[PDB]
Every structure is written in structure tokens, then in C-alpha cells.
């Protein structure tokens, strides 16, 4: 019991 | 929280490491079993718990069901949103091949970036990366949908049975949600919990909501509508039995309404009146409402059913896979004897044990949450929401049925061991198939179920409740309607006038006596205080203790056989029972 998240990014397509 | 990728960091020697990634959509997280392998995951504002997983496949769920539904259709350009430790998001593109075993993209990325998304043209994650070429993992088939509850339940005469099974989210999530619509609807709203432990359980879960537990050391209390009462079930039909203040409650919910313990009953039967009187709406939840015969049901997550032979008695050789499992087990047998003689062959051979019964469960249910054990003996009672991190469940199937006799004099026996109900079957097996583990729980099993409940006591007793349970405006309460004919008893038979109906509930309450043991001694007027009728039975209604005749200091000071005119035995089924009612007999209480 010791995990924890922090944001990268968000769901898209490159162009 | 909010949408998108998230690296999954663990706290571990001088500095957090990211050992793997995972997506958010639509409220749950998403993530592969290998990366965080069913631990819990702590956000800053949030507490996020596995709700799902499927090991074999590599995945798990946060906070609900896998919503990730679009798939890839070959011949078509992905791109991984690789989140590789200490390097910014990449989108990497590639052309994904084919499977081989029961669609993988050759891509090499470091250890960590497990649970990267993979995503088509249209911005849908189509599965995640994993299991090192590196197949594009993602569930079959999706949810396990959405909820379990939110309609317009809240409506007068309307009575609602909602089928939760464990990991349901019902105390965390549902049962706030209800009481947070019923204060906006300004209902008058009583929530019933089978036992203290479940009913402080209820408290946490409602911590901020304006809720007030009731003792039943108090016939009444009454502030107004703003505040929601909390209460045993029995300490409400006490209620009913004592007092005329009781509140025309608009809406009632009754947890664990499967309880088959009289006063459970009795309430069932009120409390459906009352929504048939146009007066409230009432929610009954349970994961075996009546009508389930299923012993086997779903459960959120995977149960392995092992049928084998059960020790109903000490062993000494032939179950070592008894004692060499690992992890915990609870054992459920049919009589507090039989769990003494169990638990005491667990404790020869090392094993922590914590026994559990109907009386000792509010002061030893506690220790299974904080101490450290590795079996749980208990009755029938932990069918009752008793919550356990466990893996395995032993169930020899077995119980004792309270049966009124007959045959001679009227009297009360303990028939048994005898096979348990199907639901209770659920029940007990319910204990596990809560939480997802690396190996599946375990249901160790012996017997079929059997519905053979038709000459039970309590269906009786409940009887001698309801029609001694008055409605201020004159209706007559009967049992709840599915529950109604598992009895043959007649309606009324068991009304009780006068002094005679007071000290009916006196004897219950503070006697601490059966239903019908009480009924008898009341309808035959008898007053509480005189403790005669306990010596005054015939020879064969002595009472025996550990192959003793017991015997008894009565308050004056004269020693007497103790032998009871009418025999229950239920008051001397175990040496608890038996102490509480010599000091009954004594007449120091």
C-alpha cells in the first residue's frame, strides 16, 4: 500500500 | 479525478519509482495486474480501490468495471503514447501483427512504461501495452456496468429489493447516495443494520450526513426529519413493542434484509404494512432476496468452488490442505460447541484462531480487522454482512434449527446438524469473491443445500411479535409477503393483553430470553420478577451442563435443580446462554 499517480498526458492522435 | 494518462509511482527506497502507467476514462482507472497487482492507489483529494481484475489477461480496474471498449481492426495504424520513467510522453506509431496461443506491436520500451495506452485514429484506447513483440492487451468484453441504484425508488407505496452482491460499492457509495437524495426530499428516513459493527460501518461511510444511532436502551427519540435514525433491527421492533412515539418514518432501508432472526422478521412485516398503508417507501437490500436459490452466484471477482471432505470434529491426520494453505480462512459451523472443538484443533497446530457467535461478535468481530489471524470459526452469524479478508471458505453446509415440538408437551429443541438453506449457502460463500487477488478465492465446500426451513421457529416467533405490534391507526401487520407462507401459524393467535403484553417485552429485553420461551411465561401470567417457574418443570426438563445436573443459589439463598417448566433450548445450547440464563434464574437481572 504505498503507489500514487501523477499525470503524463491525454488520449489523442498525433498528426 | 480527471481524465487521461497517469504514471503509477511506488514509494520505495530513497525515491518513488514509476513502475507502470495507466488511463482513466469515464471514472475508472485503468491499469495491468503485473504494475500494481490489486494494491490500492492513493491520489492527493482521492483513494482509489480495485473494484476489477482479470490476472490472466494482465488487467485490473479502479473504481468500477473495464469501460475500455473499442477494439483494433488489423490492417490499421496504431499509436502507443509510450510514458517511459524519467522521459516525456512519446507517440509512437507502428503496424501490429497476430496472435498464436488461446495483435502485437514490435515496439521496445522500457520497464515501467507497462500500461501505456494504445490508440487508433478516432482517440479510443483499442487495449494497452504489456506483456513484453508486446500484445496489445485489452478485456473482451467490457462492464459489469454502471450502478446498481438511482431511480425514482423514493415514491409511497412502492417497495424496493436491491440485489447487491459484495463489491457492489453499497455502503461506500450507494447507501450515502440514497440518504443524500432522501435529505433533499425531506423524508423522515430510518436505516436498519443487522449488528452494531455493520451499523458503525454505516457511520464512517456516512461520516459528514446528519445520522443518529439509536440504542435500544431508549424507547423513543426524536428530534425531527432533519436527522436520519440508525438502528439494529432488533432494537426497532423492540421499538414498536414499547412504545407508541414511534415516527411514521417516509422511507426505510433495511440492509441485510435476508436476516432470518425473528425480529428481523417481525420488522420486514411492519415495515412492508407501512408501505402497503400508502405511508412510506421502504428499500430492502440483500445479495439473496426472497426467491434465490442459487448457491453458486456471480461474484465481481473469480471464485474457485472445491467440493471435499470436512472435519465436523477434531482430526489428526488425513487434512493437511486444511492447514497448509497460506493465506486466511473462514470456517463456518453448525453450533459455538462445534466451533470450540474446531478451533482448539487449529490452535494445537499453531494457528491463530478467532471464534465468532451471535453475542461474542460485537467485541471479537473488531480483533479480525486489527490483530492478525489465520482462521475465523463463526456461526451462522456472519452471514449477516461480516466483512473478512480472507481467501478461502470452509463449509461443511451444516446448522441447527430451532423447532417447536408438538409431540407432548410444547417444548423448543435444537434439530441438527442439518444442511443449510441455499441462500445461506450464497451467503456463506459470499464471504469471499470480494477483493481480486493473484490466486482466486477458494469455497471449500461439502453437501448440497436444502430448503427445508418450513418448520422453523423463527417463522413462528416473528409471529408472536407482529401480532403484539400495534399501528396507530389500526391496520394489522403481517409478515412480509414472500416470507408469509413459511408458516402455518394463525394470525392473532399470539396476542397478549394487559400487563401480560409488558412483561412479554421485558422478558426479551431484559431477560435476555427467546420469543416463545418469553410467550410462554407471559401468556401465563407470570410476573417478571418471580423466578419459580425455573424449578418447578418436570424431571425430564432438567437441565444438564457438561454432563452435570445444574444447580442452582436462587436469590433467597436455597439451592434448587435448575429445571425450567417450559424447555428451550436455545438458553442452554452453550455455556454463555446457559450463564446468562442461571443468572435469570437466580434472579439477578
Given at each position: 500500500?504505498?503507489?500514487?499517480?501523477?499525470?503524463?498526458?491525454?488520449?489523442?492522435?498525433?498528426? | 479525478?480527471?481524465?487521461?494518462?497517469?504514471?503509477?509511482?511506488?514509494?520505495?527506497?530513497?525515491?518513488?519509482?514509476?513502475?507502470?502507467?495507466?488511463?482513466?476514462?469515464?471514472?475508472?482507472?485503468?491499469?495491468?495486474?503485473?504494475?500494481?497487482?490489486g494494491?490500492?492507489?492513493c491520489?492527493?483529494?482521492?483513494?482509489?480501490?480495485?473494484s476489477?481484475?482479470?490476472?490472466?489477461?494482465?488487467m485490473?480496474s479502479?473504481?468500477?468495471?473495464?469501460?475500455?471498449?473499442?477494439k483494433?481492426?488489423?490492417?490499421?495504424?496504431?499509436?502507443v503514447?509510450?510514458?517511459?520513467?524519467?522521459?516525456?510522453?512519446?507517440?509512437?506509431?507502428?503496424?501490429?501483427?497476430?496472435?498464436?496461443?488461446?495483435?502485437?506491436?514490435?515496439?521496445?520500451?522500457?520497464?515501467?512504461?507497462?500500461?501505456?495506452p494504445?490508440?487508433?485514429?478516432?482517440?479510443?484506447?483499442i487495449?494497452?501495452?504489456?506483456?513484453?513483440?508486446?500484445?496489445?492487451?485489452?478485456?473482451?468484453?467490457?462492464?459489469?456496468?454502471?450502478?446498481?441504484?438511482?431511480?425514482?425508488?423514493?415514491?409511497?407505496?412502492?417497495?424496493?429489493?436491491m440485489?447487491?452482491?459484495?463489491?457492489?460499492?453499497?455502503?461506500?457509495?450507494?447507501?450515502?447516495?440514497?440518504?443524500?437524495?432522501?435529505?433533499?426530499?425531506?423524508?423522515?428516513t430510518?436505516?436498519?443494520?443487522?449488528?452494531?459493527?455493520?451499523?458503525?460501518?454505516?457511520?464512517?461511510?456516512?461520516?459528514?450526513?446528519?445520522?443518529?444511532?439509536?440504542?435500544?436502551?431508549?424507547?423513543?427519540?426524536?428530534?425531527?426529519?432533519?436527522?436520519?435514525?440508525?438502528?439494529?433491527?432488533?432494537?426497532?421492533?423492540?421499538?414498536?413493542?414499547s412504545?407508541?412515539?414511534?415516527?411514521?418514518?417516509?422511507?426505510?432501508?433495511?440492509?441485510?434484509?435476508?436476516?432470518?432472526?425473528?425480529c428481523?422478521?417481525?420488522?420486514?412485516?411492519?415495515?412492508?404494512?407501512?408501505?402497503?398503508?400508502?405511508?412510506?417507501?421502504?428499500?430492502?437490500?440483500?445479495?439473496?432476496?426472497?426467491?434465490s436459490?442459487?448457491?453458486?452466484?456471480?461474484?465481481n471477482?473469480?471464485?474457485?468452488?472445491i467440493?471435499?471432505e470436512?472435519?465436523?470434529?477434531?482430526?489428526?491426520?488425513?487434512f493437511?490442505?486444511?492447514?497448509?494453505?497460506?493465506?486466511?480462512?473462514?470456517?463456518?459451523?453448525?453450533?459455538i460447541?462445534?466451533?470450540?472443538?474446531?478451533?482448539?484443533?487449529?490452535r494445537?497446530?499453531?494457528?491463530?484462531?478467532?471464534?465468532?457467535?451471535?453475542?461474542?461478535?460485537?467485541?471479537?468481530?473488531?480483533?479480525?480487522?486489527?490483530?492478525?489471524?489465520d482462521?475465523?470459526?463463526?456461526?451462522?452469524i456472519?452471514?449477516?454482512?461480516?466483512?473478512?479478508?480472507?481467501?478461502?471458505?470452509?463449509?461443511?453446509?451444516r446448522?441447527?434449527?430451532?423447532?417447536?415440538?408438538?409431540?407432548?408437551?410444547?417444548?423448543?429443541?435444537?434439530?441438527?446438524?442439518?444442511?443449510?438453506?441455499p441462500?445461506?449457502?450464497?451467503?456463506?460463500?459470499?464471504?469471499?469473491?470480494?477483493?481480486?487477488?493473484?490466486?482466486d478465492?477458494?469455497?471449500?465446500?461439502?453437501?448440497?443445500p436444502?430448503?427445508?426451513?418450513?418448520?422453523?421457529?423463527?417463522?413462528?416467533?416473528?409471529?408472536?411479535?407482529?401480532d403484539?405490534?400495534?399501528?396507530?391507526?389500526?391496520?394489522?401487520?403481517?409478515?412480509?409477503?414472500?416470507?408469509?407462507?413459511?408458516?402455518?401459524?394463525?394470525?392473532?393467535?399470539?396476542?397478549?393483553?394487559?400487563?401480560?403484553?409488558?412483561?412479554f417485552?421485558?422478558?426479551?429485553?431484559?431477560?435476555?430470553?427467546?420469543?416463545?420461551?418469553?410467550y410462554?411465561?407471559?401468556?401465563?401470567?407470570?410476573?417478571?420478577?418471580?423466578?419459580?417457574?425455573?424449578?418447578?418443570?418436570?424431571?425430564?426438563?432438567?437441565?444438564?451442563?457438561?454432563?452435570?445436573?445444574?444447580?442452582?443459589?436462587?436469590?433467597?439463598?436455597?439451592?434448587?435443580?435448575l429445571?425450567?417448566?417450559?424447555?428451550?433450548?436455545?438458553?442452554?445450547?452453550?455455556?454463555?446462554?446457559?450463564?446468562?440464563?442461571?443468572?435469570?434464574?437466580?434472579?439477578?437481572?
Amino acid at each position: 500500500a504505498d503507489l500514487s499517480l501523477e499525470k503524463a498526458a491525454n488520449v489523442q492522435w498525433d498528426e | 479525478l480527471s481524465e487521461g494518462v497517469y504514471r503509477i509511482m511506488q514509494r520505495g527506497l530513497f525515491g518513488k519509482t514509476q513502475v507502470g502507467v495507466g488511463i482513466h476514462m469515464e471514472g475508472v482507472f485503468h491499469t495491468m495486474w503485473h504494475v500494481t497487482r490489486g494494491s490500492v492507489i492513493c491520489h492527493e483529494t482521492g483513494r482509489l480501490e480495485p473494484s476489477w481484475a482479470d490476472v490472466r489477461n494482465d488487467m485490473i480496474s479502479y473504481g468500477g468495471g473495464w469501460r475500455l471498449g473499442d477494439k483494433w481492426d488489423k490492417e490499421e495504424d496504431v499509436q502507443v503514447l509510450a510514458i517511459e520513467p524519467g522521459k516525456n510522453p512519446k507517440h509512437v506509431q507502428t503496424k501490429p501483427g497476430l496472435f498464436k496461443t488461446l495483435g502485437a506491436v514490435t515496439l521496445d520500451f522500457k520497464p515501467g512504461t507497462a500500461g501505456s495506452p494504445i490508440i487508433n485514429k478516432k482517440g479510443k484506447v483499442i487495449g494497452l501495452y504489456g506483456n513484453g513483440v508486446s500484445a496489445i492487451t485489452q478485456a473482451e468484453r467490457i462492464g459489469e456496468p454502471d450502478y446498481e441504484v438511482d431511480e425514482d425508488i423514493f415514491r409511497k407505496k412502492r417497495l424496493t429489493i436491491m440485489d447487491l452482491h459484495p463489491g457492489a460499492g453499497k455502503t461506500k457509495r450507494i447507501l450515502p447516495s440514497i440518504v443524500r437524495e432522501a435529505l433533499k426530499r425531506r423524508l423522515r428516513t430510518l436505516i436498519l443494520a443487522p449488528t452494531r459493527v455493520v451499523a458503525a460501518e454505516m457511520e464512517e461511510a456516512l461520516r459528514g450526513l446528519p445520522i443518529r444511532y439509536q440504542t435500544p436502551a431508549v424507547k423513543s427519540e426524536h428530534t425531527g426529519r432533519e436527522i436520519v435514525d440508525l438502528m439494529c433491527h432488533a432494537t426497532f421492533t423492540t421499538r414498536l413493542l414499547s412504545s407508541t412515539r414511534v415516527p411514521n418514518y417516509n422511507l426505510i432501508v433495511m440492509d441485510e434484509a435476508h436476516f432470518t432472526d425473528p425480529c428481523s422478521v417481525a420488522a420486514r412485516g411492519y415495515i412492508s404494512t407501512r408501505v402497503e398503508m400508502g405511508e412510506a417507501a421502504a428499500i430492502f437490500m440483500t445479495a439473496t432476496p426472497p426467491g434465490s436459490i442459487d448457491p453458486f452466484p456471480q461474484s465481481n471477482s473469480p471464485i474457485e468452488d472445491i467440493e471435499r471432505e470436512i472435519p465436523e470434529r477434531s482430526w489428526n491426520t488425513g487434512f493437511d490442505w486444511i492447514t497448509d494453505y497460506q493465506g486466511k480462512t473462514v470456517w463456518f459451523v453448525p453450533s459455538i460447541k462445534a466451533g470450540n472443538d474446531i478451533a482448539n484443533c487449529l490452535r494445537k497446530s499453531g494457528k491463530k484462531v478467532i471464534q465468532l457467535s451471535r453475542k461474542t461478535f460485537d467485541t471479537e468481530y473488531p480483533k479480525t480487522k486489527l490483530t492478525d489471524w489465520d482462521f475465523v470459526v463463526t456461526t451462522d452469524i456472519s452471514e449477516m454482512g461480516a466483512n473478512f479478508r480472507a481467501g478461502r471458505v470452509i463449509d461443511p453446509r451444516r446448522c441447527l434449527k430451532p423447532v417447536i415440538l408438538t409431540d407432548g408437551p410444547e417444548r423448543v429443541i435444537l434439530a441438527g446438524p442439518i444442511p443449510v438453506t441455499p441462500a445461506s449457502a450464497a451467503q456463506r460463500r459470499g464471504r469471499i469473491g470480494r477483493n481480486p487477488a493473484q490466486e482466486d478465492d477458494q469455497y471449500v465446500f461439502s453437501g448440497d443445500p436444502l430448503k427445508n426451513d418450513e418448520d422453523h421457529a423463527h417463522w413462528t416467533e416473528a409471529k408472536m411479535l407482529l401480532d403484539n405490534i400495534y399501528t396507530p391507526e389500526g391496520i394489522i401487520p403481517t409478515l412480509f409477503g414472500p416470507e408469509r407462507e413459511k408458516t402455518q401459524a394463525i394470525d392473532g393467535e399470539f396476542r397478549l393483553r394487559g400487563e401480560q403484553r409488558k412483561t412479554f417485552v421485558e422478558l426479551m429485553r431484559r431477560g435476555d430470553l427467546p420469543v416463545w420461551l418469553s410467550y410462554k411465561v407471559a401468556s401465563a401470567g407470570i410476573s417478571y420478577k418471580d423466578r419459580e417457574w425455573c424449578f418447578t418443570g418436570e424431571r425430564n426438563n432438567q437441565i444438564l451442563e457438561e454432563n452435570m445436573e445444574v444447580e442452582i443459589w436462587t436469590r433467597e439463598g436455597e439451592k434448587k435443580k435448575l429445571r425450567p417448566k417450559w424447555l428451550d433450548a436455545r438458553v442452554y445450547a452453550d455455556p454463555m446462554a446457559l450463564k446468562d440464563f442461571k443468572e435469570f434464574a437466580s434472579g439477578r437481572k
